[PDB]
Amino acid sequence: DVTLYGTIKAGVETSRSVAHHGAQADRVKTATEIADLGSKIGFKGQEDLGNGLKAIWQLEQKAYVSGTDTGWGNRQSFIGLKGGFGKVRVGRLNNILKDTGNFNPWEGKSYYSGLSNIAQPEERHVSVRYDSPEFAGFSGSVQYVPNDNSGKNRSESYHAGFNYKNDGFFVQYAGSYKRHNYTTEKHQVHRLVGGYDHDALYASVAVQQQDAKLTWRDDNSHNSQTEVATTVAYRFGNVTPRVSYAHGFKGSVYDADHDNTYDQVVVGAEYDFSKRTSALVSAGWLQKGKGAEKFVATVGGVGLRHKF
Amino acid sequence: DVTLYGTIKAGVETSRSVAHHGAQADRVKTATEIADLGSKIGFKGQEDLGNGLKAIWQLEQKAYVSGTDTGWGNRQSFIGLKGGFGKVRVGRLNNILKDTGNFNPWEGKSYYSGLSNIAQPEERHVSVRYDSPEFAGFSGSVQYVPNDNSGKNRSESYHAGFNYKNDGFFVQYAGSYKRHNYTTEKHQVHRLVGGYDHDALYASVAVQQQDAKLTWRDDNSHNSQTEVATTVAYRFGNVTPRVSYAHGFKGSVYDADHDNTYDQVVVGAEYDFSKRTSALVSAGWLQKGKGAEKFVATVGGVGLRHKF
Amino acid sequence: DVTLYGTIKAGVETSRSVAHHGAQADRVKTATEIADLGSKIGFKGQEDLGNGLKAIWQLEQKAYVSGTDTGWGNRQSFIGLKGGFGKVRVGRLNNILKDTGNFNPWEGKSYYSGLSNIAQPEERHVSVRYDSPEFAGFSGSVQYVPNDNSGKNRSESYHAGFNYKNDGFFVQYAGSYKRHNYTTEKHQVHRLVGGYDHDALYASVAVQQQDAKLTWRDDNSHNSQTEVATTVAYRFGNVTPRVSYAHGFKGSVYDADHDNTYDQVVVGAEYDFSKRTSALVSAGWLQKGKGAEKFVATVGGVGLRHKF
Ligand SMILES: Nc1ncnc2c1ncn2[C@@H]1O[C@H](COP(=O)(O)OP(=O)(O)OP(=O)(O)O)[C@@H](O)[C@H]1O
Ligand SMILES: Nc1ncnc2c1ncn2[C@@H]1O[C@H](COP(=O)(O)OP(=O)(O)OP(=O)(O)O)[C@@H](O)[C@H]1O
Ligand SMILES: Nc1ncnc2c1ncn2[C@@H]1O[C@H](COP(=O)(O)OP(=O)(O)OP(=O)(O)O)[C@@H](O)[C@H]1O
Ligand SMILES: [Mg+2]
């Protein structure tokens, strides 16, 4: 039971930025490039005989067709076991926020297809993860990121979530907390996702908040941020139109509020010539801040993806 | 239809340089090393069902048995389609000048087996390529190298060639032009190759010229260069003697033309124990310039190559 | 006859150091981390038809599940041939001292599982190796490490050993000499290993000495070191207890000998769920020097290893 797998997707990005300059000016420009969209390669397997138990391992890395890259196992790679009790695994592994993540499936490039600012804390760390099996559509998992920090007060972080799916219907909580980080102190991220996922239709609303203690010097400082996003995919024959909106908020206080708010949106589709082979078309838009000091950006492109 | 493939070739290089010296100067020396000769690995495939169309993808990278290396998809790797209309493909891809290139098949190392100075503009860039199918021995292709440069005046470059083969007979034009480059404004490279390739015999003469505008500070400055090369390979049983000459002429300008001319030559053979497994033996020689300030170099070695 | 193979092993390391101090100094601390234990990936093969001869090639590289890594063929990778006469092979290849090495099979991490200081000269160099076939349990091999050094007086090194195995019984001499090194003029390393290896029991004693000329200013300067180690492994059902001791002696010369001596030991086991899948447990201890300026360290951990 050895398997070699992966996916290759690439194509062109036409992109533009409008940098404001309301106060003290200039507005930069289009960049148009050939870009490998998240391409990558993996090997992996499982063994039995063995028992009710099975051994699982994987090694996956970034394979850029464009070859802007380097390295091994910078993808999700691990070793672990699954059994009556589910899977325990270790090594480079996905954030519990990273594996909700289903509401943000935009094949993308050096500049965001979308929806990014909301997916900023979706990571891979060298860590440990338990994922409990299903019971009545129920699931849960937990993750430790020791690395490493003792040493000082621990920058190890802490990850877990649960997932319900009942009849094409779902919600997923994912959360992260961090005992310490420099250029920060104990930091928290929370996400709930819910929607229908099934039969040629998908819709989801997700909400993430992050509450953070701050300024290890100039205490007590702190910030909160909040983001919403929503996505509707659908399908027929081979085409799969999809759309997403994301509004992040700013925060308050610190002595000053402003509005650090952002809005962004994406639409595009997929045309399956086959299961594996899908043509991709994508157009996003985003705006940071508002008024005289502010920002806008607009991306679009095509791409191919062949999964194997 | 997945495939893993590649080739491994390595072996020893004995090398020497004679650096010419009106003194204050000196003549450097032999270096003798174990060297991986162009060794590398690849995966790739194609899909149908599908249609008259097929999906092609490849990921190939430098695999040094000597491991002086790093990375992924720094070989020719891509994604594209073939069909009635031929192949369109994208990602890291070979120059049109790089895919004539048949006249220079000397497995080589850190220093020049040969024939190098004439193969200097044979590249791989992240780009787009169309290769039209065969009609009556006829073929053609085109390539865009956007990356990236707008930004400023575009350093994107431009590549295409055609190929005729009739009855073990061939000619290949390949050409490159560059809208911009820092230290060469608007630069051009042209190559014609012709010869017999077939049935245990190969002979070819190829000619490349490069005409270049020069902005360095320099307006109006400019240079031309020209290179000829010729190669005769032949075969029996398992041995495949081969030989190559290359004479470049000078960059001609600046009130002393001088002579920047160079001459170089290579001979060696191949002994197939099988299709895949061939023992390689090679000796080159080169000379740059002439007279009191000048250069000479002499290389030779063995190696093995097993293709898979 | 192509083969993809490798092994994945990872897990946790709890570690501690006691650094001895009149102070300026102090006694440092535990570090506890998830660590990929020597994990890695390879491809390779052989061909015939061919003859009594066969072609062998391999490309193996470090694959860290933890992905602290980079690169290709930094493992043992080569090309060569085997036949009546045995194997000649080239490329990145294992030191003759490296392939005795059977007495030190502790899956390990960034800090030593064990037994390290004795395995310090077990290497891979870009080089050439002949390994003669078996005759009456007899074997031999020789290695040249040219790279590269002429240039100056040659830092190429020199490697060979022999191996006897008769009825679960063995001894292996491995030796290394180096014509030059900056940090060693003309350096030598010798190892004998002997023991029973067979049928669920393994025991070995090995001895290494290294005699070295020292050029720095110092002529004539020089040092000798000596190290002993011993290992007992055994097996039942699926568990495989093992233990190892290593005592190095000092460099002794130059009017003050001191004692640069060190002692270290390791114990732990393996539990095969299968041939491939083994759970690993390990505890080592080491001490450098003695007295008021000195050192101690203690490591322990678990890990999984799945070979493929
Ligand atoms: N660090 C990263 N940088 C860029 N893109 C990423 C990163 N992490 C994840 N991605 C993108 O997220 C996608 C995950 O979606 P998909 O379901 O296709 O794969 P996946 O489930 O992550 O695969 P695996 O389970 O092996 O990680 C990847 O294909 C990749 O395009
Ligand atoms: N960066 C490089 N510069 C010059 N020559 C190279 C370079 N990389 C590879 N080569 C050599 O060019 C030779 C061309 O031979 P070959 O046709 O087998 O490969 P290729 O056509 O480039 O590969 P592909 O099947 O991916 O198109 C190869 O043997 C390879 O070792
Ligand atoms: N640079 C290194 N640092 C630490 N440990 C290493 C290093 N190189 C090899 N090892 C360990 O030594 C062990 C050697 O055992 P093994 O026989 O499996 O490999 P090998 O013989 O070196 O490779 P090959 O199968 O290609 O001959 C490996 O398990 C490996 O993890
Ligand atoms: Mg994807």
Start-to-end C-alpha separation, chain C: 16
Answer whether C92's CB lies under 8 Å from C42's CB.
no
Resolution reached, in Å? Answer: 3.2
HSE, side-chain direction, 13 A CA sphere, residue B205: 2
**Burial grade of B80 (CB within 10 A; 0-12, 13-18, 19 or more):** buried
Token pair belonging to A16: 């533009």
Peptide bond into C50 cis (omega under 30): yes
Q: Please, which experimental method was used?
A: X-ray
In the chain, the amino acid numbered A243 is V
B107 is in an annotated binding site: yes
Residue A295 pairs with which residues in a beta bridge? A19, A288
The residue to which tokens 């300008």 are assigned: B253
Question: How far is ligand 3, taken at its centre, from the CA of residue A72, in Å?
Answer: 18
Give CA–CA dist B34/B41, Å, rounded: 20
Answer whether A178's CB lies under 8 Å from A187's CB.
yes
Start-to-end C-alpha separation, chain B: 16
Structural domain including B140 reads 1-308
The region, left, alpha or beta by phi > 0 then psi within -120 to 50, assigned to residue A254 is: left
In the chain, the amino acid numbered B243 is V
Give CA–CA dist B90/B146, Å, rounded: 12
The residue to which tokens 């062109």 are assigned: A12
Cβ-based contacts of A2 with chain C (< 8 Å) = 4, 308
Closest CA to C98 of C209, C183, C176: C176
**Burial grade of C295 (CB within 10 A; 0-12, 13-18, 19 or more):** middle
At A16, which CATH number?
Answer: 2.40.160.10
With an 8 Å Cβ cutoff, are A8 and B150 in contact?
no
What are the E-state strand segments in C123-241? 124-135, 138-145, 157-165, 169-181, 184-198, 201-214, 221-234
Distance in Å, alpha carbon of C63 to nearest chain A alpha carbon: 6
Contacts of B253 (CB under 8 A, 6+ apart): B221, B222, B223
Contacts of C33 (CB under 8 A, 6+ apart): A146, A147, A148, C12, C13, C15, C109, C110
Sign of CA dihedral A114, A116, A118, A121: positive
Give CA–CA dist A121/A124, Å, rounded: 10
Angle C46-C48-C49 (CA atoms, 0-180°, nearest 5)? 160
* Radius of gyration for chain A, computed over Cα atoms and rounded to the nearest angstrom: 21
CA C198, distance to chain mean position in Å, is 21
**Coarse DSSP helix, strand, coil percentages of chain C, rounded to the nearest 5 percent:** 0, 60, 40
Closest CA to C252 of C228, C226, C227, C229: C226
Give CA–CA dist C1/C47, Å, rounded: 7
Sign of CA dihedral C178, C180, C182, C184: positive
Cβ-based contacts of A146 with chain C (< 8 Å) = 32-34
Start-to-end C-alpha separation, chain A: 16
Does ligand 1 lie within 6 Å of residue A76's CB atom? Answer: yes
Residue C55, SS3 per DSSP? strand
Does ligand 3 lie within 6 Å of residue C38's CB atom? Answer: yes
The region, left, alpha or beta by phi > 0 then psi within -120 to 50, assigned to residue A66 is: alpha
With an 8 Å Cβ cutoff, are A150 and C9 in contact?
no
Contacts of A135 (CB under 8 A, 6+ apart): none
Give CA–CA dist A75/A59, Å, rounded: 8
Give CA–CA dist A199/B135, Å, rounded: 46
Among chain C residues, the shortest Cα distance to A127 is held by: C34
Cβ-based contacts of A89 with chain C (< 8 Å) = none
- What is the DSSP secondary structure assignment for residue B182, as one 8-state letter? T
**Burial grade of B187 (CB within 10 A; 0-12, 13-18, 19 or more):** buried
Give CA–CA dist C200/B258, Å, rounded: 78
Does ligand 3 lie within 6 Å of residue C76's CB atom? Answer: yes
CB atoms within 10 A of CB A85: 13
With an 8 Å Cβ cutoff, are B92 and A67 in contact?
yes
The region, left, alpha or beta by phi > 0 then psi within -120 to 50, assigned to residue C164 is: beta
B57 to chain A, any CB pair closer than 8 A? The answer is yes
Query: Number of structural domains, chain A?
Result: 1
